[PDB]
Each structure stands twice: as C-alpha cells, then as structure tokens.
Amino acid sequence: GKSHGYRSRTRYMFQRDFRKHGAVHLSTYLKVYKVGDIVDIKANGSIQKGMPHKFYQGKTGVVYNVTKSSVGVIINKMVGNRYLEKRLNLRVEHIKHSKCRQEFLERVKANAAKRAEAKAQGVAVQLKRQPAQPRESRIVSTEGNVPQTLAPVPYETFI
Amino acid sequence: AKSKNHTAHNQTRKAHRNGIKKPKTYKYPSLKGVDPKFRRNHKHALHGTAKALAAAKK
Amino acid sequence: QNPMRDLKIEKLVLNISVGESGDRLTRASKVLEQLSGQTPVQSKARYTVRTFGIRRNEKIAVHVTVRGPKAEEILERGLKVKEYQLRDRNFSATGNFGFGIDEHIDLGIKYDPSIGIFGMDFYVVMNRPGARVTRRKRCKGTVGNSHKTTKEDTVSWFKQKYDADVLDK
Amino acid sequence: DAKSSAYSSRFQTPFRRRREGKTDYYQRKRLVTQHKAKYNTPKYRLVVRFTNKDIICQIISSTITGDVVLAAAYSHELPRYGITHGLTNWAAAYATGLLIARRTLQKLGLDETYKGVEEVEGEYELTEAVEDGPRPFKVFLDIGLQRTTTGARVFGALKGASDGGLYVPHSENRFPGWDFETEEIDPELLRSYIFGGHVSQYMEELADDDEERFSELFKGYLADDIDADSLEDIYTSAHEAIRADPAFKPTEKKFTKEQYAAESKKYRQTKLSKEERAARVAAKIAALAGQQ
RNA sequence: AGAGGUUCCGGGGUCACCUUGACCUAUUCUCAAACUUUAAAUAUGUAAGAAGUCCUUGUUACUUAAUUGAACGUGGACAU
RNA sequence: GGAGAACAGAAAUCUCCAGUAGAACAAAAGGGUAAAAGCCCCCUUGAUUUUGAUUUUCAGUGUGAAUACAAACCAUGAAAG
RNA sequence: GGUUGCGGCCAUAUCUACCAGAAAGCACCGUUUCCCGUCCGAUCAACUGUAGUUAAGCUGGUAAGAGCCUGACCGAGUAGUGUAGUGGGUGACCAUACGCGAAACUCAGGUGCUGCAAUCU
Ligand SMILES: [Mg+2]
Ligand SMILES: [Mg+2]
Ligand SMILES: [Mg+2]
Ligand SMILES: [Mg+2]
Ligand SMILES: [Mg+2]
Ligand SMILES: [Mg+2]
Ligand SMILES: [Mg+2]
Ligand SMILES: [Mg+2]
Ligand SMILES: [Mg+2]
Ligand SMILES: [Mg+2]
Ligand SMILES: [Mg+2]
Ligand SMILES: [Mg+2]
Ligand SMILES: [Mg+2]
C-alpha cells in the first residue's frame, strides 16, 4: 500500500539537528515580522502546531498576514504548467528573516549614500554590481621566488 | 492486461510548451486571509484618509 | 577543621515491610505512629511477584522519617538492641548507615494489644551543613568533593560519640 | 564521575541559566513573547526576587541583545524611607513594590494620573483606567522559580505595585487572608500583613513567652527602641515617604570604578600562556623523570 | 583477535592455588537501503528596487502607558 | 547501575550516589519532548457556538485530516498565556 | 575588575581532579507565632540579618586532562560527482578532457564573549 500522509518522507528533515534539541531560544519569539517581509521556511520539528508542509521547507516567501503567534507567507508553487500562490499560516518557530533581503537593503542604503556623495561632487558614480572581470596585467617578480619544481612522480605503491 | 502504470516522461516538455507562468503579481493584493481585525480597521482608516483628502482638496 | 564541616543527621527513616495489606499493616502503622509521634506513610508495591504474595499498588509497607533531635533520641533506643555494635557493612559508600532490629522492644509501650512482633529497619542519612544546595529549587547545585560524606567519615563519627565499634562480633 | 568521551561528546548542555538554576525558560517564553501584531511593543514584567537580606523589584522588557531595565527598586534603600529592620519581610516586599510603582509612574510621566490606592485598606483593588485618558501601565508579574503559596511575599510586591498605580493583573486568592474553605478574602488580615501586623504580634508574643528568643530575634528593635505597636506607624510613614519622592537617589560609591577595578584585580588569578604552560609541562617531565 | 583487572557473580583444584567464563578498561580487523557526528557534485527556493529609497506628517472603530506602532496615504527630493 | 538496611533473597519496600534520556507518551513506524510533551496532584469540559480564510491528497473538485485567525462564551492559572 | 538581579548567543560556557577568593554581594546558616505546605519547617512558607561560616554552593586558576570550538597548501585537489568522446577493456570497471569538490585523519590555537540595571577597597 502506498502511504502519502502529511508528514510522510520527513524522517531526517523535521529532525532536530544534533546537540540542538530541546527548547526554542527566545530570539525566535523576539523577532518582528511585518507584512512584506521576505522569510525562509525551516520547520522546527519540536513545535508541532503551525508546521508547514514538507513541500514548503526551504522555500522563501513574502509575509502577507501577521497574527498572534503566526505569520502568513505567500509561496509560489509550481503546479503543472504554471505557478499558484499558496498562503501559509505558519507559527514563528518555523520562520526566519531572509538575509538575502537584509543585505539587499544594505546595498540600497549604500547606493543612496554613494549617489548622494557623487551629487556632493560633480562626478558620475557607476553604482551597478559588476561580475568577476578578467585579471589585469602583472609583473611577477622572481627575487626570492626562483621558479623551481620538478616533474611527475614514479608509481610507488605504499600499501 | 499488463501495461505501463505511471511515468513522468514528456510531462516537463509539455509543461514548457506554453511556458511555466509566474502568477502575475499586482499592486493592491486581495485582503483574503489577512486578519479581520486589521481589515475592519483598515476600511475605516482608508475611508477617513479619503475623507480628509477630499476636505483638503475640494 | 571548620564548624560547617560537621557530620550531622538529616533523617532517620524507619521501615516496616509487610507483604500484605489491611490489618497487619495498620498495626505496623500504629507502632510507627506511637514510636515517632508523626503519622507514617505507606508504600505500594511497584510490581507483582506472586511468590512474595504482593500485587501492584497494594500498600505493602510503611515507613516514617524523623528529623532533628527526635531522630537522635530513637538512635540510642535502636542501638541498645544492637548492643551498640555494627559491622564493616551496614555503612554506605555514600556515608549513610543503617541496621535492623526486632520486637520494637519496650521503650514507650502503649496499651499493647494482640499485635505481635514487628521488626524494622533503621536508616540514618548523614551529611554536613550546606546540604540544602542539592535540595533547594533555585540554583540546585552539587556538593563538592571535600564536603561529601564518605564511609570513613561516618564510621569515624560512629566510633566517636555513641562510643561504638564496627566489624566486631 | 569519570564520564566516557562518548558521553561528553553526545552531551547537550542546558542553556546557561537552566544550568545555573536561575531561569525557567518554559515560563519565560510565555512571559516574554508578544502578540506579533503588537509588533515592537515591549512586554514589561515586574521581576520580584528574594535573596537573603534583599528584595529586588525590577521592571524589565526584552530585546534580542538582552533584557532592558526601565525602573528598578531594592529593599535596601528602604532605610532612606524609614524601614530599617526586616528588609525581606512581607511589608518590605509591599513597600518595595510600591516604590517601584511610584518610581516607574513618575519616570513615564504617569504619576499624577493613577495615584493608586492612597488610603490602604487591604482590599483587592485592581487599577482601573481613567476614561478619555492614558491607560494604566500594564506590567505582568514575574516570580521566577519560587512557588506560589497563599501568602508568599512575592504577592506582597504584587499588591504594592498594584497599589502604587500600575495595572498589574492578578487575582486575590494568593494574598494572605484567603480561605481555602470559602472563596473570600480577609482584607483585615491582608492589611495587617501590609503594615507588619504579623511581625508585631510575634514581637508582642515573644516578649511574653520567652525573653531570650526576643533578645535573639528583634535585637535590632531593642537596640534603637522600636516598640512593637509602632510598626504600623513606621510602614505608614514609609509609604508616603515613598510616594513623596521615589526619584532614586543613588549612592556616592565612595570610590571610582577604576579604583574598584584596580583594587579587585589584585586578587583575580591570571590565566597562564602557552610558553609558561609548556615550561611547566617540560619541567614536570624533567623533575618527575630526572631519575628521582 | 589477542592484552591488563582475584569472585559461594555455581571455574571443578587452598576445605587462597598452571588448568578462570562472562563482565570492565585501553587497543585491534571488517561493515550497514530501512545506522550515524559529518557531508558533497547535480538538481532546488528567494532577492538583485519607480508597486523603490529617504524626509515631513494625515486617517483609523486596530494597537500602545503614551500618534507608540501597524497599514494605507498627502506633500517634497532622488530618473547617463 | 553501584553502595547500604530483620525476615528479604536474583527479585517486596526504605536511603544515598551516578544517571542526555539508554524511560514514558493508548495502538505501526518515524519525528518530537527533561523545573516536559513523561510521573503525581488540583481545578475542569475549548471533545462548546457562528462564519469566512488556509494547507495536504487536488482538477487546485469533493471527502477526510489539519493550520492560523475573527466575533462570542467558558476552563485554567498569581499572571503572562 | 568583583558580585547580584534579568538576560542574548546556548559547552571557547560542559565534565573530572585539585588549589585559591580581599571588599561587597550571593550563599550556607538561626527561629517556627502568623500565611502556607509536608510522613519529616529536608524542600516549600513565614520571621530575624540576629547566634555563626566561607566548609560547601558560586567565581577564578591549574592539568603534555576528557569533551567542545576555530583554523590550516594536514590528509587532499584524494574520495565522490556534473558534462564529453565511434575512449581503453570480453567484462568488472578504468583512464583522460572541461568543472565542482568532501569526510575521517593529522597539526596548531582556544577554553566563554557580552546587553540593561544595581552595588562593592
Ligand atoms: Mg513512504
Ligand atoms: Mg537536517
Ligand atoms: Mg494507459
Ligand atoms: Mg511556573
Ligand atoms: Mg539509497
Ligand atoms: Mg502513546
Ligand atoms: Mg525519537
Ligand atoms: Mg508543567
Ligand atoms: Mg485519510
Ligand atoms: Mg531550615
Ligand atoms: Mg524559603
Ligand atoms: Mg584537551
Ligand atoms: Mg574550560
């Protein structure tokens, strides 16, 4: 018989992360979630109320609703040939903020500061990120660094 | 009569024939599922804001 | 060495294990009640043996816990039965000790009905001051190594006052 | 003793204060967690702790970096209000709670409104809200680890903080004077406990039973001639002494903290370094195996 | 797979002994789809902004001890 | 598990120490849980009313099960909850 | 800098053995009329900071300590793996090309950091 329950195939994944079992520390409850905050979903297996489904662990969504002990998260789910919006009522033990968005807002603050500094001057700023450019020309010195290496090694066995 | 039971062959190809569509996000999302205590207040906050803007504009 | 490194009795716990309930164990409660001046508490059997005659949750024992000077008073009244003699055993490796007497002999007899003979177990729990630190709720710590009661310390405290000796027949 | 390396490897410690036996985290989560739609609103608790020879009342909110104290009052500054003896008794707990309530209210600017129970009668009075005004300062009681008994003096600080003007939500059935048999309170017994009636009756009974115990206990009362019927006058005078100026004058400290540090550093052992640790190991090898 | 550790823990042999099993301790050889401290590669979620950012302050019957926040805004600034 | 206590030992109850869970949580197996979710005690009926929203199987139908709220009304507790 | 109360991260904090602690704090400690709770004022409750003590808790230090944490061109670009070939090989498997890349091990270092408030030669 096929078994397809709500917590099927969740043996290792709602597991409680060796030597970090037990109580949930208080900063989880002390974080503040507002509507529009982007949050990662990672289900705490010790807290059984308000758990997400096993599909939604690892998924990242936008908070749409904030309640007494939970937040509502919108997750796009690929169903067939399209995505569907999934509204999730998850207690805040299974939710943490997205550090990608945290560093994005620090990048927004940095971009605003650099544009304000370039407006204090008269120069352009060129404030887009650029990829890893190819390396420029070098002059590798040899003083103390004479190029010294030999050939491949023979086959010895050392069993 | 014995035959093929289930396969997911060709399903991703058919899924990507007409693309995989993202759900077309909007400004002003629906307040379906948002807290009713927030909704009842927000209706009145919006009504008072529009009233005050009409009074300040006329 | 210090006045707070002094071995003192916490409790003398007095145990009568009677492998049946009802009338005989109410007599066993009566003798501990009149001996100690406190009502005793009864103990149910943990499991069923069928050879000891006991069943689960059957109240097959009584015991009482006496603290303060009243435990010291029953200590001599039990040790005269033992002729102020104990053994190389009877002393725990944790520093507690205890023995067993019969007849609860004569000291403070009541109206004395047709009860019969009731032997009993005396067990004396020894420590030093500062033993609250494992018993209190807040900051429930552990007594350090120099302050822990040992078998040598409690047998030296016994071969001191009460003037007794051990291992001698 | 002598645990295996597998035991020490797989051992998971409790946090630090569960190890120390100071904090109930099961109580703390419930006491600190706010309604998430009350987004950054702090949740203040009246921490009431009883050491030997002190009573600590604090108003504490919580951040991720740590707890934050808004106003704190101790029973050892009750000498400046007049109470010099029995600083851990039920009445000193009441006066410490009243002190932190008045101090907190004039800190927030909320003391002219919400005067609280001025004339104290031992009635179960919970602080009500002024209509078309600011609401009373809601503060939840945090007793920590100590047990709730009918008449425990942490409910003394509960009663004192509620009487000072804080809305501290409680029920009347842990105060002294509650009967187990009937669901009614004794306001006169509670009012005696407020003004130290239970100490005064024992003072007037020890002198009549055995003067030796009345010389052991209450030696400080006979030292400066505090008669047993003036306890109510002392606590009464101290209550409006508290109410007239709860502003927290601090001590002069009679030294500076740099001198304190420089003088307490002379008795703090300093950790050794790699070089003298290795020198100790090598000299241990040489001495213990220098052919005796 | 050998080493070290004395016992009416039913080794027969002092009536404390070559011919002691388990157990304990430090080692040792080899493993696990339904074992695990770890832990990839490939596959996988989200973000990379005008529906944005900052400043001022309007509404509310929500929320706060308190225009304190929340949500939506007005007005202003920022479009190689 | 170790050390002790007349009958009492392999195992009856009593006492101490070690004890990260090697126990228990109705029932499979997996997950979870130590001032607890286990054991014992006290109070109790929220195993109640009404209506939306959500999740999983899904066609994003039904049924089942569950989640977070909202208006009540209660229980509990000193209270937060 | 010590200490307390409330903590954040939850072993660099735990565990074992030993030693030290001035001041204050904390603690043990003293009492049982009241509130309260026990078989037992041991715990819990109350009262006195009074009779005493740093013995313990607590804090710090020591250990070629166990554990834990961090780092390393240490193992090791090894194992595994994505991609490629009308590559090798009877096969099992393997080498190569473009990539990603561990773990155990072995060494070295470390052994709580800190927030609010109060107090202390
Ligand atoms: Mg399955
Ligand atoms: Mg995992
Ligand atoms: Mg077919
Ligand atoms: Mg509690
Ligand atoms: Mg497999
Ligand atoms: Mg079960
Ligand atoms: Mg499990
Ligand atoms: Mg509980
Ligand atoms: Mg079903
Ligand atoms: Mg006592
Ligand atoms: Mg107490
Ligand atoms: Mg080490
Ligand atoms: Mg250390």
Swiss-Prot record, chain A:
What are the alphabetically sorted keywords of the record? Cytoplasm, Isopeptide bond, Ribonucleoprotein, Ribosomal protein, Ubl conjugation
- Gene Ontology molecular function: structural constituent of ribosome
Q: Per its UniProt record, what Pfam families does this chain match? A: Ribosomal_L21e
Pinpoint the Glycyl lysine isopeptide (Lys-Gly) (interchain with G-Cter in ubiquitin) cross-link: 31
- This protein's major location comes to cytoplasm
GO terms in the biological process aspect are:
cytoplasmic translation
The Gene Ontology CC terms held by the record are: cytosol; cytosolic large ribosomal subunit
- Gene3D superfamilies in the record: 6.10.250.3260, Ribosomal protein L21
As for subcellular location, the record says: Cytoplasm
User: Which superkingdom does the taxonomy of this entry point to?
Assistant: Eukaryota
Family label:
Belongs to the eukaryotic ribosomal protein eL21 family.
Question: Further notes on this entry?
Answer: There are 2 genes for eL21 in yeast.
The protein's job, in short, is:
Component of the ribosome, a large ribonucleoprotein complex responsible for the synthesis of proteins in the cell. The small ribosomal subunit (SSU) binds messenger RNAs (mRNAs) and translates the encoded message by selecting cognate aminoacyl-transfer RNA (tRNA) molecules. The large subunit (LSU) contains the ribosomal catalytic site termed the peptidyl transferase center (PTC), which catalyzes the formation of peptide bonds, thereby polymerizing the amino acids delivered by tRNAs into a polypeptide chain.
Describe its assembly.
Answer: Component of the large ribosomal subunit (LSU). Mature yeast ribosomes consist of a small (40S) and a large (60S) subunit. The 40S small subunit contains 1 molecule of ribosomal RNA (18S rRNA) and 33 different proteins (encoded by 57 genes). The large 60S subunit contains 3 rRNA molecules (25S, 5.8S and 5S rRNA) and 46 different proteins (encoded by 81 genes).
Swiss-Prot record, chain B:
GO CC terms, sorted = cytoplasm; cytosol; cytosolic large ribosomal subunit
Its localization reads:
Cytoplasm
Q: What is its main location?
A: cytoplasm
Region feature Disordered, mapped onto this chain: 1-36
Q: Where is the composition biased (Basic residues)?
A: 1-25
Its Gene Ontology molecular function terms? structural constituent of ribosome
A Pfam short name: Ribosomal_L29e
User: Cross-link Glycyl lysine isopeptide (Lys-Gly) (interchain with G-Cter in ubiquitin) - where?
Assistant: 51
What biological-process terms (Gene Ontology) are attached? cytoplasmic translation
Q: Which UniProt keywords apply?
A: Cytoplasm, Isopeptide bond, Ribonucleoprotein, Ribosomal protein, Ubl conjugation
Q: Does the keyword Ribosomal protein apply?
A: yes
Question: Does this entry carry the keyword Magnesium?
Answer: no
Any extra remark in the record?
Answer: Present with 51100 molecules/cell in log phase SD medium.
Q: What family does the database annotate?
A: Belongs to the eukaryotic ribosomal protein eL29 family.
Give the protein's function. Answer: Component of the ribosome, a large ribonucleoprotein complex responsible for the synthesis of proteins in the cell. The small ribosomal subunit (SSU) binds messenger RNAs (mRNAs) and translates the encoded message by selecting cognate aminoacyl-transfer RNA (tRNA) molecules. The large subunit (LSU) contains the ribosomal catalytic site termed the peptidyl transferase center (PTC), which catalyzes the formation of peptide bonds, thereby polymerizing the amino acids delivered by tRNAs into a polypeptide chain.
Q: How does it assemble?
A: Component of the large ribosomal subunit (LSU). Mature yeast ribosomes consist of a small (40S) and a large (60S) subunit. The 40S small subunit contains 1 molecule of ribosomal RNA (18S rRNA) and 33 different proteins (encoded by 57 genes). The large 60S subunit contains 3 rRNA molecules (25S, 5.8S and 5S rRNA) and 46 different proteins (encoded by 81 genes).
Curated annotation (Swiss-Prot), chain C:
State one molecular function term (GO). Answer: rRNA binding
Could you tell me which residues carry N6,N6,N6-trimethyllysine? 70
Gene Ontology BP annotations? cytoplasmic translation; ribosomal large subunit assembly; translation
Q: What Pfam families does this protein map onto?
A: Ribosomal_L5, Ribosomal_L5_C
Record flagged with keyword Glycoprotein: no
Which SUPFAM superfamilies does the UniProt entry name for this protein? RL5-like
Does the record bear Nucleus in its keywords?
yes
The record's keywords, sorted A to Z, are: Acetylation, Cytoplasm, Methylation, Nucleus, Ribonucleoprotein, Ribosomal protein, RNA-binding, rRNA-binding
UniProt subcellular location: Cytoplasm; Nucleus
Transmembrane intervals: none
A GO term from the CC aspect? nucleus
Q: How is it modified after translation?
A: N-terminally acetylated by acetyltransferase NatA.
Entry function: Component of the ribosome, a large ribonucleoprotein complex responsible for the synthesis of proteins in the cell. The small ribosomal subunit (SSU) binds messenger RNAs (mRNAs) and translates the encoded message by selecting cognate aminoacyl-transfer RNA (tRNA) molecules. The large subunit (LSU) contains the ribosomal catalytic site termed the peptidyl transferase center (PTC), which catalyzes the formation of peptide bonds, thereby polymerizing the amino acids delivered by tRNAs into a polypeptide chain.
Additional notes on this entry: Present with 39000 molecules/cell in log phase SD medium. There are 2 genes for uL5 in yeast.
- Family of this protein: Belongs to the universal ribosomal protein uL5 family.
Protein name, per record: Large ribosomal subunit protein uL5A
**Lineage from the top down?**
Eukaryota, Fungi, Dikarya, Ascomycota, Saccharomycotina
Swiss-Prot record, chain D:
The yes or no answer to whether the keyword tRNA-binding is present is no
Cellular compartment(s): Cytoplasm; Nucleus
Quote any Pfam family the record assigns.
Answer: Ribosomal_L5e
List UniProt keywords, sorted A-Z. Answer: Cytoplasm, Isopeptide bond, Nucleus, Phosphoprotein, Ribonucleoprotein, Ribosomal protein, RNA-binding, rRNA-binding, Ubl conjugation
Query: Where the protein is mainly located, per its record?
Result: cytoplasm
GO molecular function per UniProt: 5S rRNA binding; structural constituent of ribosome
Tell me a GO cellular component: cytosol
Placement of covalent cross-link Glycyl lysine isopeptide (Lys-Gly) (interchain with G-Cter in ubiquitin) = 159
Kindly state a single biological-process term from the GO annotations of this entry: cytoplasmic translation
Q: Which residues carry this modification: Phosphoserine?
A: 162, 171, 230
Residues of the signal peptide: none
Segments forming a coiled coil: none
The UniProt entry's sequence similarity note says: Belongs to the universal ribosomal protein uL18 family.
Question: What does the protein in this record do?
Answer: Component of the ribosome, a large ribonucleoprotein complex responsible for the synthesis of proteins in the cell. The small ribosomal subunit (SSU) binds messenger RNAs (mRNAs) and translates the encoded message by selecting cognate aminoacyl-transfer RNA (tRNA) molecules. The large subunit (LSU) contains the ribosomal catalytic site termed the peptidyl transferase center (PTC), which catalyzes the formation of peptide bonds, thereby polymerizing the amino acids delivered by tRNAs into a polypeptide chain.
HAMAP family in the record, alphabetically? Ribosomal_uL18_A
This chain belongs to the protein called: Large ribosomal subunit protein uL18
Q: What is the lineage of its organism?
A: Eukaryota, Fungi, Dikarya, Ascomycota, Saccharomycotina
Q: Which gene encodes it?
A: RPL5
